[PDB]
Design a protein around this ligand. Structure first.
Ligand SMILES: Cc1cc2nccc(-c3ccc(Cl)cc3)n2n1
Ligand SMILES: [Mg+2]
Ligand SMILES: [Zn+2]
Length: 308
């Protein structure tokens, strides 16, 4: 577990978000992309507005942030950018559903989002091992000196957020998303979905985690495009690691077959992304704008495929 300098955590402490972004950042389609030096700042901002300025000692919280930063790796996609992008989408979901989520949930979900791919190497998991590792990394960072941002909580408050965070992180394993979303489909339609049921809560939170994880598909077209190149630059670098031992990479992880990508995107939107946001919109109607953006980008990929 690496840790931040004093100057890193102190630098975050003096950050103020510039005002011109104050409305942007509440938008589901907000792109953090242009603002690299602000990304830790942005996360402080979001925590402050979702959970309140007096929810974590500023000090330990900046300590936590800058250190989580240093346990991400400088790979194309599963890096610090993605963790802040994921966090932000969760912030937007929290903001438009405020009355449904407990304080304990709101703090745990933002932190878990930030930590969701901790120490990702960029190579494919190809049971939920990666996610269980991510959660363990999160425990390590928490255990560190001056780093336990939950110190001001009770024994059962603590032993409960840790659990909200474990479940959240695990839920980011797309293999589990399918059965969970199916499960949620059934419940909702039978009318048997109970938010007062803790196990049902966990299911919905699962879907939220997926919806955040994948939120690159819900940005503006110019942004959605550039971000596809980032994910793909990792499949390909892994496929190269296949080639280097004469192995054939599956055709997604071969950068020779580069013009496969828009069809791959369309497939993925149809099989994975649209259902995800579809169901989420149904359980949480204020997240509609994610579904709309996803559809808009689906429609763009068709045009590339049809050569327009
Ligand atoms: C955000 C984004 C765009 C995209 N395109 C193709 C494939 C995937 C993908 C993502 C996660 C997993 Cl586990 C598997 C595949 N993704 N993810
Ligand atoms: Mg992950
Ligand atoms: Zn992720």
């Amino acid at each position: 577990m690496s840790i931040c300098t004093s100057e890193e955590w102190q630098g975050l402490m003096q950050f103020t978000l510039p005002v011109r972004l104050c409305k942007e950042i509440e938008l589901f389609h907000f792109d953090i992309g242009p603002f690299e030096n602000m990304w830790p700042g942005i996360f402080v901002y979001m925590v402050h507005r979702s959970c309140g300025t007096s929810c974590f000692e500023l000090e330990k919280l900046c300590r936590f942030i800058m250190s989580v930063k240093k346990n991400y790796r400088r790979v194309p996609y599963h890096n610090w950018k993605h963790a802040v992008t994921v966090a932000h989408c969760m912030y937007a979901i929290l903001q438009n559903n405020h009355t449904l989520f407990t304080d304990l949930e709101r703090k745990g979900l933002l932190i878990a989002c930030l930590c969701h791919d901790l120490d990702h190497r960029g190579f494919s998991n190809s049971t939920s091992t990666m996610e269980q590792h991510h959660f363990s990394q999160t425990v390590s960072i928490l255990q560190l000196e001056g780093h336990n941002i939950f110190s001001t909580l009770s024994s059962s408050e603590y032993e409960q957020v840790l659990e909200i965070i474990r479940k959240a992180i695990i839920a980011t394993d797309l293999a589990l998303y399918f059965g969970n979303r199916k499960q949620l489909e059934e419940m909702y339609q039978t009318g048997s979905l109970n938010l007062n049921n803790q196990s049902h809560r966990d299911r919905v939170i699962g879907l939220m985690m997926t919806a955040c994880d994948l939120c690159s598909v819900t940005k503006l077209w110019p942004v959605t495009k550039l971000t596809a190149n980032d994910i793909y630059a990792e499949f390909w670098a892994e496929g190269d690691e296949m080639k280097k031992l004469g192995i054939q990479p599956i055709p997604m992880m071969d950068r020779d077959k580069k013009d496969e990508v828009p069809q791959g995107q369309l497939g993925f939107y149809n099989a994975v992304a649209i259902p995800c946001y579809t169901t989420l919109t149904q359980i949480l109607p204020p997240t509609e704008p994610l579904l709309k953006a996803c559809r808009d980008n689906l429609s763009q990929w068709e045009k590339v495929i049809r050569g327009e």
